[PDB]
């Protein structure tokens, strides 16, 4: 097991376990999960009301500095009623550590626009609005950035299929470029690669 399989440090695991237990017990209003994976990167799973309070806690307090902001995407999971997952990803300049603040949300009710404490979150929340439609009340400007203007559909969902519905062509009839329903030249084949036979016995779920 030792050659060519990456060994690990339980020390970092114990440190993150204690730290997550600490954060969970000192902000008990919103914490439902603090989970620690095998390779010691922390995840905190949070109700969609403690967004501003928990991030104001996590920017400061001199026990968890974490100024640095990164990705925000809301991984589209059906077979839920709360479909979307807003994922903040935070980095400490002082402590060299990564915590994933996963808050959950539904289709139509907004989370509370983290740009108030995070000046990096402006185009991140604009991107999430453009690709998904997750609304952000109390925000300076929401537009469509990383899409076409006249295009709509919020394409990074699962309901939006791989091809777009519209497809441009120039035509000399009205001397300009128009959009048409999509006429593919080939099928985009679909390989049923989901093989059976239980490749991981540990991650089994109880059947009914």
């Amino acid at each position: 097991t030792r050659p060519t399989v990456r060994p690990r440090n339980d020390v970092a695991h114990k440190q993150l376990s204690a730290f997550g237990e600490y954060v969970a017990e000192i902000l008990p209003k919103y914490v439902q999960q603090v989970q620690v994976s095998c390779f010691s990167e922390l995840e905190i799973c949070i109700h969609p009301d403690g967004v501003i309070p928990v991030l104001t806690f996590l920017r400061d307090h001199s026990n968890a500095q974490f100024k640095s902001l990164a990705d925000l995407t809301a991984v589209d999971i059906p077979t839920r009623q709360n479909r979307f997952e807003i994922v903040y990803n935070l980095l400490s300049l002082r402590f060299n550590s990564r915590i994933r603040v996963k808050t959950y949300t539904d289709e139509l009710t907004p989370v509370e626009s983290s740009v108030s404490v995070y000046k990096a979150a402006n185009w991140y929340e604009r991107e999430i609005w453009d690709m998904f439609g997750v609304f952000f009340a109390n925000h300076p400007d929401l537009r469509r950035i990383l899409t076409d203007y006249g295009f709509e559909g919020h394409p990074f969902r699962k309901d939006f299929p791989l091809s777009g519905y519209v497809e441009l062509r120039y035509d000399d009839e009205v001397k300009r470029v128009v959009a048409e329903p999509v006429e593919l030249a080939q099928e985009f084949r679909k390989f049923d690669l989901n093989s059976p036979w239980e490749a991981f016995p540990a991650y089994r779920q109880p059947p009914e």
């Binding site: 497809e167 062509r169 120039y170 035509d171 000399d172 009839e173 001397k175 048409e180 329903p181 006429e183 030249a185």
Partner: protein
């Protein structure tokens, strides 16, 4: 008939639609719009040219991937024309310079060209051959143009009798001749009553009639909706455009209805008037 001439599915962008069309011309104006609407329908178009391939290059990507195909024809040999119409569903004939050249008159393009192509066509077995004609091209006077067209009309009517001889009135559009001459002025003013017909209803009518069978044998004529004086129309052109010999004779010559033959209403296409599209097309004035 064999498969892959039958229509397939919805329309547009290499949906295999019905007609396989050999077009003589189409490097000019009306044939270019006609290839455009057949590309919207999704029809394979075989067009031969004769000029530099740069012109057919700037009208090339109208089709989808590899639908339309280009080859050569000449006004002399039946072998090149016959090779160009070896396999065709339909064929349309649209040709003509509006001045005599060194090597061609108004005679023998309008005379000699439909002769040979109809010869190899009727020996070839094409169907739904559509031959255009100028409206009111008579045996009567004032135009070698109009009388050679009348001779060609009698040719295409007599040999290969079930051709749709079609005639619009004199059309206007983005690349009109007579409205361009109205822009390329100076002046002189006469009287003639005249109906202008816009180009897109004409080419919509041509593609609808060529794709709809049972409407064959009959010559058709396309009608302008307004039908008023020429000089009032020139005042209209200067008003909308903000500024204060054969072509001018052949617009002063003849504009009338012919009550014998059926027009737009046997086709089901809405008439776009002069006013709407004329305001749309009169750009290129001062600011």
């Amino acid at each position: 008939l064999h498969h892959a001439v039958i229509p397939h599915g919805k329309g547009g962008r290499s949906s295999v639609s019905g007609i396989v069309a050999t077009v003589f011309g189409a490097t000019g104006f009306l044939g270019r719009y006609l290839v455009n609407h057949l590309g919207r329908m999704g029809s394979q178009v075989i067009v031969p040219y004769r000029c530099e391939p740069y012109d057919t290059m700037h009208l090339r990507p109208m089709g989808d991937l590899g639908q339309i195909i280009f080859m050569d024809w000449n006004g002399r040999d039946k072998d090149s024309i016959r090779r160009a119409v070896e396999h065709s569903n339909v064929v349309i004939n649209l040709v003509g310079r509006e001045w005599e050249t060194k090597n061609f008159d108004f005679e023998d393009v309008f005379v000699k060209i439909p002769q040979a192509i109809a010869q190899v066509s009727k020996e070839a077995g094409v169907e739904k051959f559509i031959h255009i004609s100028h409206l009111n091209a008579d045996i009567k006077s004032s135009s070698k143009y109009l009388r050679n067209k009348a001779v060609g009309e009698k040719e295409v009517r007599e040999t290969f009798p079930e051709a749709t001889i079609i005639k619009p009135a004199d059309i206007f559009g983005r690349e009109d001749r007579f409205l361009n001459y109205f822009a390329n002025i100076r002046s002189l003013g006469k009287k003639t009553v005249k109906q202008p017909v816009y180009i897109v209803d004409v080419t919509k009518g041509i593609i609808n009639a060529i794709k709809d069978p049972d409407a064959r044998g009959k010559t058709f004529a396309f009608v302008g909706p307004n039908r008023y004086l020429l000089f009032d129309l020139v005042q209209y052109v200067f008003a909308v455009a903000h500024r204060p010999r054969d072509k001018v004779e052949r617009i002063h010559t003849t504009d009338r209805t012919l009550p014998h033959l059926p027009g737009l209403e046997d086709l089901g296409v809405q008439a776009t008037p002069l006013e709407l599209k004329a305001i749309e097309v009169l750009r290129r004035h001062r600011t």
